[PDB]
Amino acid sequence: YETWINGTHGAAGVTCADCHMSYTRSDDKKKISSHWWTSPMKDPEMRACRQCHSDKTPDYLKSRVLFTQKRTFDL
Amino acid sequence: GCSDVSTELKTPVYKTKLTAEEIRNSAFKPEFPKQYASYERNDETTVMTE
Amino acid sequence: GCSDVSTELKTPVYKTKLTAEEIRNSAFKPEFPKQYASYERNDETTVMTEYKGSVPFNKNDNVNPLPEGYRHAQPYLKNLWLGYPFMYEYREARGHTYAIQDFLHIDRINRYAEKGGLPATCWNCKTPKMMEWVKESGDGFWAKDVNEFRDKIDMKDHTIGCATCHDPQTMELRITSVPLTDYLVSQGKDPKKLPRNEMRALVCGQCHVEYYFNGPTMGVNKKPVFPWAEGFDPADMYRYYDKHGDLQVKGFEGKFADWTHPASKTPMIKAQHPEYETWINGTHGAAGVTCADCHMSYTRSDDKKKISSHWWTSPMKDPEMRACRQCHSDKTPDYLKSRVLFTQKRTFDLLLAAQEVSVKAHEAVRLANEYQGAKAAGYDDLMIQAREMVRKGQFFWDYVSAENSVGFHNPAKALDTLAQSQQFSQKAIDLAMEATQYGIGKDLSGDIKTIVPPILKMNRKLQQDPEFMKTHKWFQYLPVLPKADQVWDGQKRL
Amino acid sequence: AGCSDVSTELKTPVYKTKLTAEEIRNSAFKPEFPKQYASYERNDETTVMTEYKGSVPFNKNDNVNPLPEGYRHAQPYLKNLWLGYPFMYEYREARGHTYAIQDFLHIDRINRYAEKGGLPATCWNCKTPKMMEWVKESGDGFWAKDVNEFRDKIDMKDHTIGCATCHDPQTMELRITSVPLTDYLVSQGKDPKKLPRNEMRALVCGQCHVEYYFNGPTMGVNKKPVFPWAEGFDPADMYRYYDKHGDLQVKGFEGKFADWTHPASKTPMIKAQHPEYETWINGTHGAAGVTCADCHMSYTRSDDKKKISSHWWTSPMKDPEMRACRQCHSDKTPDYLKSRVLFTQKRTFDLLLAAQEVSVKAHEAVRLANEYQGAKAAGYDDLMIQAREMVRKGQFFWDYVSAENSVGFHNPAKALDTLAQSQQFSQKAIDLAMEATQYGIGKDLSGDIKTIVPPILKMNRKLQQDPEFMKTHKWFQYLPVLPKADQVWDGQKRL
Amino acid sequence: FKAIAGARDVYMNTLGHPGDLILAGMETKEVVNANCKACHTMTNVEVASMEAKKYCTDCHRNVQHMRMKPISTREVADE
């Protein structure tokens, strides 16, 4: 919570539920809220990200996540 | 001529059969089987990201 | 008032800057960066579904963890492929982009001599460089040694790539396979005038099929041929192998064999990845549901516009099963997964079982081959009938085993076929016993895993160690290989 | 021309008959529901045949004689496999619901050569809406009476499996009148009066089209019908059910259930019966919620211009146009559809025939081992138990599929998978009977099994009275020669 | 089109005898698929989705009035 609140996403109103409970059209084509609380990176189509970042490909998004993770972990 | 928008978008309002202090997960299953099936996906324990 | 549909849907027409014989993958990248990026997803090699995935683990290894083995393996493979190149190494199939890397790392091709011991025909479903090689050597290409092209190929730029399927100029769909063209012609169909929905299967049918090589007396020496003239089912291919071949062994005159099993002395057929022939009359294929429909489904990754996924992998890697969810928009991804596993679990379990009884069959024939007591008066004729059944059973289970869908492509066929395999293997055991007047029985009593233990470790290197070729009873049917240093490490020479 | 919107509700029409709460006579529903009744009467057709099924009640073990006696697709070994059990006397292809009581009164499985049928009144349980009065009249005590007691206390045409079995006589609401199904539903925490429409469109058939068993005297209410479903709906589950619920005192089978013992192999057996429901529930249609009613009772406009549910319960394959399937599979042609059914059925029937051959071989192996006179293995006894156990498991497995009426179509993968397992078990039996006799029995198990144990084509209660005929098959030495007796019952007439 | 289909539908509902199966005729399969194209062009601009199957609905199966779903979710008897 305390990490997220002033992070590039939280600062702009982007919410845990926005990413970890994204809408998914699994009931015919109707939205329900994903109650699968896990890594957004398990979905190879990064669909949770892909309304807000509809101009980037899933792989582009993955590479931008790893850009941060790899430096952070190593440090 | 008339509209064809005969179903208007409304914020869902819910009223369950459950008592005010219900805590048992399995009591939620019958009224919300979709969210439940999604909740059950958390039992997956073999996938690693990076 | 006017229309607002100012962009009309049209079928895309392409005209590239590329020359008519272009084969290099990297030449395709500038004009189609979207499909290319999708093509590059095949480099992912860490994700397993339940029975499949892109980790190239050893398919006979249910012992060591990933990446060496896995919980779903076939422990008996090496026993069953004794004396045949598949006993050295056989791993889970992975992304197309790895085709040449893995081809040149496999121990099946000999790397302890100059000669590979296998025909250049091995290159057939690996590289679009096949077009020049044939244009240059003609009918003479196939019979050359595989290792002769080992160092004349770009591992990244010449793997199964765009030219395997597309015309480099127009991007139209092409069949570039020689053996597939051979069948299509034998059927009266024109490979340049084929209906789209057929193409969306045939492009994969270029390589994902059961094949064999002509022997010296069957036509062009070492040419690939799809055994399809009798139909697509196991019975049809087995009947095809009854009439096309070169065996001279009494009882099997005229029949084909990939090798003879050196323990049972049974003339064996080898099956490989018959996805096409399995799919064609399966619940999906029968109804015009195509490889491309599932493995190249449309994905809206370019803004919201469709492009065709060129990520050839398991549909089960996407937790939202989107490839399925237009046609089955009423079922949830999880529902679909559970229906896949409904077939897969039964099929895989039945496979292991069918494989055990096949080992038992081989073993029975081995004991009957060597028996010193009183034989029946029809011993010789019964040994043939026995070996005939060892061969038939193994083909049937190989047909299913070697097939990557694990039942899914054709549920009914897969299961049917394993059941018949069981009958055949067991009929062999029955015949082997009849012939020895049941004198072998005492040696077939326990669990098969005790009397013939599964062979976990075997490669061309170990087959050099005389100490090692003593550790298992079936190793006495193999020769001890001569001391040799490794000569080929990938593409370089040691 | 018209102006209010459709309803999302899908409200089923509501009825208020003139009938009393306890009305059970079929012909009482006629004047108020002529179109459904008309349709119900179409079950009287008994001449039309499909590839594997039909409405001709031929003898299911007869691939020798032509229709109506036999049929090209039959199971020649039935009588060998059910030696010493009533199903060895007669067993016919099922036909329309209107014939049920007539065919019950005609079957040779019920003793008609004595006063007592030798079988429990529970046999009526799925034949008549007379069940309700009878259970109300005699309570727990009903089931264990002889079956013949009610033989003449029923109207063959007016009291067959008609409307009252499924409909409340007053409101016409779908209803569950079965006691054994009610028992299961209650054990799951479900309310039979408050079930969703879709569930009922399957459960109404689920009242009868199942695998059942009777309680033995120490298992609870004596001869009461129970569905072995507590472990699940698959063969493996049902077999595990039968490991833990039963009365056997035979060494190595203690506590297990048995319907009879095979006189030849001395194997305590299970009989499976028509598990259409258990088969359909996790097959590709059932798991998707496509109910028996979708296929066997699809909507028809035939009459007038108004759509009713067809009450012609028969093979969906009788129809050249497959009209029923095509409410869903509208993109497929009728002949396409037929071909996909045959795909499953040919495979399933072919495999089934194989599994029965090997079942017979097993019985023969174990029979041989039982009477074997040479040097026995040190473990003879344990082996002989393990061997009997497999004969048992193997038979239940094929029986599960054989008795099932769709020939694999309701659940392709369960069927074929199950058949394959049947095979493995039956063979294991042989291997053990062989192990136990140090293979001295091999010499008697060599050829084609049809020349070692020939199919029993003929057998009924009358013939079992003839001692000359009883010397006609090697296996007849394990059955008694029945006392010479006159036919007591002819249908509903006492003689 | 409206007056022809209209006229033909009134006739079928009165003097004619409709079957157990109501199926779209060739002509209506055609005007429908055209209207698929009309509203979902941009999703499909870069992809020969038109050449694969005859009609869009050969993939988007349930846009055809949920044909795959159990009978009880679609239909009841008449009053």
Ligand code: HEC
């Ligand atoms: C009438 C008797 C038939 C026949 C002969 C078939 N169907 Fe159906 N079908 C339906 C659904 C929902 C599926 C699974 C696909 C999905 O989940 O959408 C199927 C599948 C089939 C198959 C292929 C499977 C197989 O094992 O062979 C076949 C050959 C088949 N069906 C034939 C839906 C329905 C219905 C909707 C309520 C109805 C009615 C039918 N099917 C009826 C029939």
Ligand code: HEC
């Ligand atoms: C509102 C404007 C519509 C639309 C869009 C449709 N209908 Fe009907 N229709 C009626 C009947 C009795 C039939 C069966 C005819 C037969 O047996 O072939 C139909 C059929 C259809 C179809 C399918 C056949 C075709 O290709 O046209 C379709 C797509 C269709 N209708 C659409 C009856 C009526 C009505 C009674 C007067 C009315 C009003 C409508 N339909 C209205 C509409």
Ligand code: HEC
């Ligand atoms: C205002 C109320 C909204 C309208 C109108 C639409 N949205 Fe959304 N949306 C969100 C996600 C994470 C998805 C993914 C769907 C999937 O699983 O594929 C969607 C989907 C849609 C779609 C389908 C669009 C497509 O083709 O991709 C439409 C037409 C749509 N939504 C309309 C997320 C959100 C969200 C974040 C919290 C909000 C506030 C909305 N959507 C709101 C609307």
Ligand code: HEC
């Ligand atoms: C595979 C065969 C196939 C064909 C043929 C096809 N589609 Fe699609 N369609 C798909 C798949 C798969 C998706 C999923 C794309 C995604 O979400 O990544 C899709 C998605 C769509 C969507 C987005 C709807 C959604 O789920 O959000 C639209 C709109 C669409 N298609 C329209 C059409 C039209 C119009 C046609 C005919 C001209 C057509 N499609 C033909 C398979 C097909």
Ligand code: HEC
């Ligand atoms: C971590 C907290 C959390 C838990 C635990 C949780 N949910 Fe939710 N749920 C949410 C949020 C956040 C929303 C949507 C927020 C909004 O109202 O916009 C939601 C939405 C819903 C909705 C509305 C329909 C929809 O899809 O949006 C239902 C119904 C629901 N949840 C049921 C359940 C059920 C059933 C469970 C347990 C099995 C559950 N929830 C567990 C946080 C949770």
Ligand code: HEC
């Ligand atoms: C007619 C087509 C075809 C021919 C001919 C062919 N292959 Fe393959 N190969 C395939 C296909 C399809 C796959 C992926 C499917 C699979 O392995 O199950 C594959 C996978 C492989 C792999 C990686 C998987 C493994 O076994 O570890 C190797 C290595 C390989 N082939 C080498 C060979 C060799 C050696 C030969 C000659 C003996 C050969 N190929 C002949 C089609 C072919």
Ligand code: HEC
């Ligand atoms: C030129 C021959 C060729 C063609 C054409 C071809 N394949 Fe392959 N395929 C192979 C070979 C070889 C491999 C194994 C590569 C390896 O493991 O190194 C393979 C691997 C695969 C895999 C393994 C993917 C994974 O990640 O596990 C899939 C799936 C597959 N092929 C499907 C297809 C489909 C679908 C098509 C049609 C679009 C197709 N193939 C066309 C030869 C071919």
Ligand code: HEC
């Ligand atoms: C194994 C076969 C195969 C290979 C390899 C392959 N494609 Fe394709 N490609 C297809 C199929 C199938 C389609 C769909 C065409 C259709 O439905 O008519 C397609 C479609 C396309 C299209 C048309 C636009 C679209 O997405 O439908 C382009 C452009 C394309 N591929 C480029 C490439 C490039 C670049 C490569 C190499 C990096 C490549 N393809 C590799 C089979 C293949």
Ligand code: HEC
């Ligand atoms: C109806 C959908 C469908 C069709 C049609 C289809 N496949 Fe599949 N394929 C699947 C599914 C589902 C799996 C199993 C995925 C798993 O278990 O991980 C699979 C498995 C495979 C695999 C193994 C994937 C891996 O991880 O190694 C290959 C290779 C393959 N199919 C190739 C083909 C070929 C070639 C064709 C055409 C002959 C074809 N498929 C037709 C859906 C389909």
Ligand code: HEC
């Ligand atoms: C009261 C018990 C009972 C109920 C309820 C019941 N069945 Fe039957 N069914 C039977 C019996 C008993 C027979 C055997 C009658 C005979 O062979 O003479 C039979 C025969 C059949 C036949 C064969 C008819 C033929 O023409 O070949 C079909 C089909 C059938 N049932 C299906 C159904 C369906 C569908 C339902 C649900 C709507 C259903 N049953 C409900 C007991 C029942």
Ligand code: HEC
């Ligand atoms: C998806 C369609 C479908 C469903 C659902 C279905 N059936 Fe059937 N049924 C068939 C078909 C097809 C046959 C094969 C008939 C033949 O061989 O001619 C069949 C066969 C039968 C038969 C034998 C018919 C005869 O000629 O005697 C009976 C009885 C039966 N089913 C009962 C049931 C019951 C009970 C259920 C529910 C649990 C059920 N069916 C569900 C389609 C269906």
Ligand code: HEC
């Ligand atoms: C074996 C079960 C069974 C039997 C016997 C049976 N019905 Fe039905 N009945 C059903 C089912 C299932 C429906 C469909 C109900 C639904 O869709 O909700 C139905 C529907 C009906 C309906 C509602 C209108 C319609 O057509 O959907 C009426 C009225 C009806 N039946 C009357 C009768 C009559 C009269 C008889 C005796 C001749 C009879 N039923 C026998 C199971 C049965």
Ligand code: HEC
């Ligand atoms: C008058 C109709 C209309 C209005 C207004 C409209 N849309 Fe759409 N929308 C459509 C249609 C039609 C499509 C599908 C076109 C296609 O498949 O290419 C679509 C597609 C979409 C998509 C998928 C394509 C994309 O660009 O992401 C999204 C998301 C969407 N609409 C959301 C919205 C939002 C948010 C707004 C408000 C700014 C909006 N729509 C306004 C009709 C409309």
Ligand code: HEC
């Ligand atoms: C999204 C487009 C769409 C809309 C909107 C739509 N339908 Fe349909 N309709 C279809 C499709 C697709 C078919 C089947 C076409 C075929 O046979 O290829 C169809 C077929 C039909 C049929 C007979 C064929 C069948 O499968 O039942 C009728 C009747 C019909 N439509 C009427 C209506 C009526 C009335 C409405 C308004 C409530 C409506 N449609 C709304 C797409 C639509």
Ligand SMILES: CCCCCCCc1cc(O)c2ccccc2[n+]1[O-]
């Ligand atoms: C003179 C024009 C006014 C008459 C309007 C008729 C309305 C009408 C009636 C129908 O039954 C239809 C069935 C299918 C398609 C369109 C249909 N339209 O438009």
Ligand SMILES: [Ca+2]
């Ligand atoms: Ca793989």
